[PDB]
Amino acid sequence: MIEVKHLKTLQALRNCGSLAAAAATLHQTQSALSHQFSDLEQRLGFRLFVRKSQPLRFTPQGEILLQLANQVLPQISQALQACNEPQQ
Amino acid sequence: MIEVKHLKTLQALRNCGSLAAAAATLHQTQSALSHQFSDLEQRLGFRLFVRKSQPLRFTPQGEILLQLANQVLPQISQALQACNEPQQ
Ligand SMILES: [Mg+2]
Ligand SMILES: [Mg+2]
């Protein structure tokens, strides 16, 4: 199942361009990041990015979930900022 | 930090009306659900629903995150349905 951490990690793959560079940004190891994705791909039933691809390419399902991330993550951020607004 | 499971659980509190009824829906115990929320409230820095309240009342921060859930969860659902569409 898709979690918020998977959506941010998908953004790191696009923003950093490789599994190793994104792992360095997310303070994780490269294998642990690869293990998290294949673990997610197994439960979802489809792959998120092209295996062995260099440069790394997303699958159509990965592009869909990346666009999902670009939409949900700013909304969660704005919601938590409103929760911490000096009011209510 | 807000997770997808926290957003669905917030919807269960509104849809079921109590911590005990929502726990039965989510296949969790009542204390484990209460432990998950106070755990989340501790890290966020604010409370999500009024303590001891009967009937259960959300705080203003809980209403904000509930409206967040009503917006994000359908988008995640539509994204996964598109991923499983017989195409791509
Ligand atoms: Mg993988
Ligand atoms: Mg609590």
PDB file of C-alpha atoms and ligand atoms in Angstrom:
ATOM      1  CA  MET A   1       0.000   0.000   0.000  1.00  0.00           C
ATOM      2  CA  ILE A   2       1.171   3.512  -0.879  1.00  0.00           C
ATOM      3  CA  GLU A   3       2.447   5.490   2.109  1.00  0.00           C
ATOM      4  CA  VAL A   4       3.523   9.112   2.418  1.00  0.00           C
ATOM      5  CA  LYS A   5       7.134   7.944   2.744  1.00  0.00           C
ATOM      6  CA  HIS A   6       6.853   6.133  -0.597  1.00  0.00           C
ATOM      7  CA  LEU A   7       5.589   9.314  -2.260  1.00  0.00           C
ATOM      8  CA  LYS A   8       8.447  11.439  -0.908  1.00  0.00           C
ATOM      9  CA  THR A   9      10.924   8.723  -1.897  1.00  0.00           C
ATOM     10  CA  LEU A  10       9.484   8.723  -5.425  1.00  0.00           C
ATOM     11  CA  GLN A  11      10.162  12.463  -5.558  1.00  0.00           C
ATOM     12  CA  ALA A  12      13.751  11.829  -4.448  1.00  0.00           C
ATOM     13  CA  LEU A  13      14.324   9.422  -7.350  1.00  0.00           C
ATOM     14  CA  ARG A  14      13.139  12.091  -9.784  1.00  0.00           C
ATOM     15  CA  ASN A  15      14.970  14.940  -8.028  1.00  0.00           C
ATOM     16  CA  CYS A  16      18.242  13.018  -7.608  1.00  0.00           C
ATOM     17  CA  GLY A  17      18.114  10.835 -10.727  1.00  0.00           C
ATOM     18  CA  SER A  18      19.443   7.557  -9.329  1.00  0.00           C
ATOM     19  CA  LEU A  19      18.672   5.084  -6.576  1.00  0.00           C
ATOM     20  CA  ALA A  20      22.039   5.757  -4.920  1.00  0.00           C
ATOM     21  CA  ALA A  21      21.772   9.557  -4.994  1.00  0.00           C
ATOM     22  CA  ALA A  22      18.193   9.522  -3.695  1.00  0.00           C
ATOM     23  CA  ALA A  23      19.232   7.209  -0.853  1.00  0.00           C
ATOM     24  CA  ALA A  24      21.949   9.659   0.205  1.00  0.00           C
ATOM     25  CA  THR A  25      19.350  12.444   0.321  1.00  0.00           C
ATOM     26  CA  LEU A  26      16.847  10.358   2.310  1.00  0.00           C
ATOM     27  CA  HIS A  27      19.524   9.294   4.846  1.00  0.00           C
ATOM     28  CA  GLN A  28      19.143   5.650   3.810  1.00  0.00           C
ATOM     29  CA  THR A  29      21.422   3.086   2.225  1.00  0.00           C
ATOM     30  CA  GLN A  30      21.107   2.248  -1.461  1.00  0.00           C
ATOM     31  CA  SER A  31      20.131  -1.386  -0.870  1.00  0.00           C
ATOM     32  CA  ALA A  32      17.563  -0.511   1.806  1.00  0.00           C
ATOM     33  CA  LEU A  33      15.921   1.933  -0.603  1.00  0.00           C
ATOM     34  CA  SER A  34      15.897  -0.711  -3.336  1.00  0.00           C
ATOM     35  CA  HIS A  35      14.462  -3.192  -0.830  1.00  0.00           C
ATOM     36  CA  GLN A  36      11.706  -0.750   0.152  1.00  0.00           C
ATOM     37  CA  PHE A  37      10.665  -0.263  -3.483  1.00  0.00           C
ATOM     38  CA  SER A  38      10.645  -3.925  -4.528  1.00  0.00           C
ATOM     39  CA  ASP A  39       8.744  -4.604  -1.308  1.00  0.00           C
ATOM     40  CA  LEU A  40       6.173  -1.992  -2.347  1.00  0.00           C
ATOM     41  CA  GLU A  41       6.096  -3.223  -5.954  1.00  0.00           C
ATOM     42  CA  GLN A  42       5.398  -6.764  -4.732  1.00  0.00           C
ATOM     43  CA  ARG A  43       2.323  -5.749  -2.738  1.00  0.00           C
ATOM     44  CA  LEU A  44       0.980  -3.313  -5.352  1.00  0.00           C
ATOM     45  CA  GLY A  45       1.374  -5.854  -8.163  1.00  0.00           C
ATOM     46  CA  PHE A  46       3.394  -3.690 -10.565  1.00  0.00           C
ATOM     47  CA  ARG A  47       6.806  -2.086 -10.946  1.00  0.00           C
ATOM     48  CA  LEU A  48       7.457   1.600 -10.283  1.00  0.00           C
ATOM     49  CA  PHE A  49      10.663   2.135 -12.284  1.00  0.00           C
ATOM     50  CA  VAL A  50      12.457   0.266 -15.046  1.00  0.00           C
ATOM     51  CA  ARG A  51      14.806  -2.406 -13.732  1.00  0.00           C
ATOM     52  CA  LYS A  52      18.504  -1.984 -14.585  1.00  0.00           C
ATOM     53  CA  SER A  53      17.713   1.256 -16.426  1.00  0.00           C
ATOM     54  CA  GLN A  54      20.573   3.756 -16.688  1.00  0.00           C
ATOM     55  CA  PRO A  55      19.662   6.551 -16.436  1.00  0.00           C
ATOM     56  CA  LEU A  56      16.839   5.453 -14.146  1.00  0.00           C
ATOM     57  CA  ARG A  57      13.427   5.478 -15.835  1.00  0.00           C
ATOM     58  CA  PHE A  58      10.019   5.308 -14.182  1.00  0.00           C
ATOM     59  CA  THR A  59       7.348   2.917 -15.387  1.00  0.00           C
ATOM     60  CA  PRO A  60       3.969   4.392 -16.368  1.00  0.00           C
ATOM     61  CA  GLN A  61       2.726   3.365 -12.917  1.00  0.00           C
ATOM     62  CA  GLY A  62       5.683   5.152 -11.333  1.00  0.00           C
ATOM     63  CA  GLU A  63       4.903   8.327 -13.273  1.00  0.00           C
ATOM     64  CA  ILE A  64       1.289   8.151 -12.077  1.00  0.00           C
ATOM     65  CA  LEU A  65       2.359   7.801  -8.444  1.00  0.00           C
ATOM     66  CA  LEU A  66       5.002  10.507  -8.871  1.00  0.00           C
ATOM     67  CA  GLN A  67       2.313  12.920 -10.062  1.00  0.00           C
ATOM     68  CA  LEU A  68       0.233  11.726  -7.115  1.00  0.00           C
ATOM     69  CA  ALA A  69       3.125  12.689  -4.825  1.00  0.00           C
ATOM     70  CA  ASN A  70       3.540  16.126  -6.421  1.00  0.00           C
ATOM     71  CA  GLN A  71      -0.125  16.749  -5.530  1.00  0.00           C
ATOM     72  CA  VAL A  72      -0.600  15.180  -2.085  1.00  0.00           C
ATOM     73  CA  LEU A  73       2.651  16.183  -0.376  1.00  0.00           C
ATOM     74  CA  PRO A  74       2.084  19.977  -0.667  1.00  0.00           C
ATOM     75  CA  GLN A  75      -1.452  19.491   0.684  1.00  0.00           C
ATOM     76  CA  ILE A  76      -0.217  17.587   3.744  1.00  0.00           C
ATOM     77  CA  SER A  77       2.400  20.305   4.289  1.00  0.00           C
ATOM     78  CA  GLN A  78      -0.174  23.105   4.101  1.00  0.00           C
ATOM     79  CA  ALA A  79      -2.458  21.198   6.483  1.00  0.00           C
ATOM     80  CA  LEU A  80       0.244  20.826   9.140  1.00  0.00           C
ATOM     81  CA  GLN A  81       1.251  24.481   8.741  1.00  0.00           C
ATOM     82  CA  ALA A  82      -2.376  25.476   9.337  1.00  0.00           C
ATOM     83  CA  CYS A  83      -2.446  23.239  12.422  1.00  0.00           C
ATOM     84  CA  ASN A  84       0.567  25.131  13.804  1.00  0.00           C
ATOM     85  CA  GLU A  85      -0.772  28.555  12.836  1.00  0.00           C
ATOM     86  CA  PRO A  86      -0.944  30.820  15.917  1.00  0.00           C
ATOM     87  CA  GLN A  87      -4.702  30.291  16.257  1.00  0.00           C
ATOM     88  CA  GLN A  88      -7.304  27.609  17.004  1.00  0.00           C
TER      89      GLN A  88
ATOM     90  CA  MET B   1       4.415  12.731  11.046  1.00  0.00           C
ATOM     91  CA  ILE B   2       1.073  12.259   9.288  1.00  0.00           C
ATOM     92  CA  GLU B   3       0.760   8.933   7.469  1.00  0.00           C
ATOM     93  CA  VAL B   4      -1.950   7.597   5.177  1.00  0.00           C
ATOM     94  CA  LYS B   5      -3.016   5.203   7.940  1.00  0.00           C
ATOM     95  CA  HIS B   6      -3.548   8.152  10.296  1.00  0.00           C
ATOM     96  CA  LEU B   7      -5.773   9.857   7.721  1.00  0.00           C
ATOM     97  CA  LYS B   8      -7.944   6.770   7.204  1.00  0.00           C
ATOM     98  CA  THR B   9      -8.130   6.278  10.974  1.00  0.00           C
ATOM     99  CA  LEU B  10      -9.271   9.893  11.368  1.00  0.00           C
ATOM    100  CA  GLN B  11     -12.078   9.133   8.915  1.00  0.00           C
ATOM    101  CA  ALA B  12     -13.041   6.089  10.995  1.00  0.00           C
ATOM    102  CA  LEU B  13     -13.424   8.232  14.126  1.00  0.00           C
ATOM    103  CA  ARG B  14     -15.792  10.538  12.247  1.00  0.00           C
ATOM    104  CA  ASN B  15     -17.634   7.705  10.477  1.00  0.00           C
ATOM    105  CA  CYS B  16     -17.988   5.539  13.601  1.00  0.00           C
ATOM    106  CA  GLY B  17     -18.246   8.265  16.250  1.00  0.00           C
ATOM    107  CA  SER B  18     -16.142   6.733  19.022  1.00  0.00           C
ATOM    108  CA  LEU B  19     -12.650   5.395  19.574  1.00  0.00           C
ATOM    109  CA  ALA B  20     -14.016   1.922  20.346  1.00  0.00           C
ATOM    110  CA  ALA B  21     -16.309   1.708  17.312  1.00  0.00           C
ATOM    111  CA  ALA B  22     -13.611   2.975  14.944  1.00  0.00           C
ATOM    112  CA  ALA B  23     -11.165   0.408  16.334  1.00  0.00           C
ATOM    113  CA  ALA B  24     -13.624  -2.403  15.588  1.00  0.00           C
ATOM    114  CA  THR B  25     -13.893  -1.173  11.991  1.00  0.00           C
ATOM    115  CA  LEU B  26     -10.112  -0.876  11.553  1.00  0.00           C
ATOM    116  CA  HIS B  27      -9.521  -4.388  12.985  1.00  0.00           C
ATOM    117  CA  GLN B  28      -7.578  -2.931  15.918  1.00  0.00           C
ATOM    118  CA  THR B  29      -8.079  -2.858  19.663  1.00  0.00           C
ATOM    119  CA  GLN B  30      -9.396   0.264  21.368  1.00  0.00           C
ATOM    120  CA  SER B  31      -6.241   0.848  23.422  1.00  0.00           C
ATOM    121  CA  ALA B  32      -3.918   0.316  20.449  1.00  0.00           C
ATOM    122  CA  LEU B  33      -5.879   2.917  18.482  1.00  0.00           C
ATOM    123  CA  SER B  34      -5.692   5.334  21.413  1.00  0.00           C
ATOM    124  CA  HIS B  35      -1.966   4.606  21.689  1.00  0.00           C
ATOM    125  CA  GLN B  36      -1.457   5.310  17.979  1.00  0.00           C
ATOM    126  CA  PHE B  37      -3.183   8.698  18.253  1.00  0.00           C
ATOM    127  CA  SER B  38      -1.432   9.937  21.401  1.00  0.00           C
ATOM    128  CA  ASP B  39       1.804   8.746  19.802  1.00  0.00           C
ATOM    129  CA  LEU B  40       0.998  10.864  16.739  1.00  0.00           C
ATOM    130  CA  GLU B  41      -0.158  13.821  18.849  1.00  0.00           C
ATOM    131  CA  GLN B  42       3.131  13.734  20.773  1.00  0.00           C
ATOM    132  CA  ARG B  43       5.270  14.029  17.643  1.00  0.00           C
ATOM    133  CA  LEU B  44       3.038  16.600  15.915  1.00  0.00           C
ATOM    134  CA  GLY B  45       2.887  18.800  19.022  1.00  0.00           C
ATOM    135  CA  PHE B  46      -0.904  19.116  19.273  1.00  0.00           C
ATOM    136  CA  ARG B  47      -3.999  17.068  20.039  1.00  0.00           C
ATOM    137  CA  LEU B  48      -6.320  15.722  17.347  1.00  0.00           C
ATOM    138  CA  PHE B  49      -9.515  15.170  19.362  1.00  0.00           C
ATOM    139  CA  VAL B  50     -10.832  16.372  22.704  1.00  0.00           C
ATOM    140  CA  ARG B  51      -9.715  14.191  25.599  1.00  0.00           C
ATOM    141  CA  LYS B  52     -12.480  12.460  27.585  1.00  0.00           C
ATOM    142  CA  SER B  53     -15.099  13.996  25.285  1.00  0.00           C
ATOM    143  CA  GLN B  54     -18.391  12.102  25.021  1.00  0.00           C
ATOM    144  CA  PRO B  55     -19.518  12.161  22.295  1.00  0.00           C
ATOM    145  CA  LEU B  56     -16.020  12.314  20.824  1.00  0.00           C
ATOM    146  CA  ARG B  57     -15.087  15.761  19.502  1.00  0.00           C
ATOM    147  CA  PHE B  58     -12.204  16.665  17.213  1.00  0.00           C
ATOM    148  CA  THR B  59      -9.887  19.552  17.988  1.00  0.00           C
ATOM    149  CA  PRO B  60      -9.500  22.267  15.335  1.00  0.00           C
ATOM    150  CA  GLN B  61      -6.279  20.524  14.286  1.00  0.00           C
ATOM    151  CA  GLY B  62      -8.164  17.236  14.004  1.00  0.00           C
ATOM    152  CA  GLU B  63     -10.803  18.848  11.793  1.00  0.00           C
ATOM    153  CA  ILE B  64      -8.051  20.234   9.548  1.00  0.00           C
ATOM    154  CA  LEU B  65      -6.429  16.813   9.185  1.00  0.00           C
ATOM    155  CA  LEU B  66      -9.823  15.158   8.700  1.00  0.00           C
ATOM    156  CA  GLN B  67     -10.522  17.490   5.777  1.00  0.00           C
ATOM    157  CA  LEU B  68      -7.012  16.681   4.566  1.00  0.00           C
ATOM    158  CA  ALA B  69      -7.955  12.989   4.643  1.00  0.00           C
ATOM    159  CA  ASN B  70     -11.226  13.553   2.771  1.00  0.00           C
ATOM    160  CA  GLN B  71      -9.119  15.111  -0.012  1.00  0.00           C
ATOM    161  CA  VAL B  72      -5.982  12.951  -0.224  1.00  0.00           C
ATOM    162  CA  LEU B  73      -7.465   9.472   0.214  1.00  0.00           C
ATOM    163  CA  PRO B  74      -9.708   9.613  -2.908  1.00  0.00           C
ATOM    164  CA  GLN B  75      -6.719  10.867  -4.924  1.00  0.00           C
ATOM    165  CA  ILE B  76      -4.520   7.961  -3.813  1.00  0.00           C
ATOM    166  CA  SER B  77      -7.375   5.576  -4.647  1.00  0.00           C
ATOM    167  CA  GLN B  78      -7.832   7.022  -8.140  1.00  0.00           C
ATOM    168  CA  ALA B  79      -4.070   6.858  -8.727  1.00  0.00           C
ATOM    169  CA  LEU B  80      -3.864   3.158  -7.853  1.00  0.00           C
ATOM    170  CA  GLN B  81      -6.943   2.404  -9.970  1.00  0.00           C
ATOM    171  CA  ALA B  82      -5.254   4.122 -12.918  1.00  0.00           C
ATOM    172  CA  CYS B  83      -2.113   2.060 -12.275  1.00  0.00           C
ATOM    173  CA  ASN B  84      -4.206  -1.121 -12.539  1.00  0.00           C
ATOM    174  CA  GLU B  85      -6.163   0.070 -15.574  1.00  0.00           C
ATOM    175  CA  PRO B  86      -5.811  -2.446 -18.437  1.00  0.00           C
ATOM    176  CA  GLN B  87      -3.228  -0.273 -20.203  1.00  0.00           C
ATOM    177  CA  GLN B  88       0.304   1.108 -19.821  1.00  0.00           C
TER     178      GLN B  88
HETATM  179 MG    MG C   1      12.961  -2.411  -6.927  1.00  0.00          MG
HETATM  180 MG    MG C   2      -4.972  10.138  22.312  1.00  0.00          MG
END
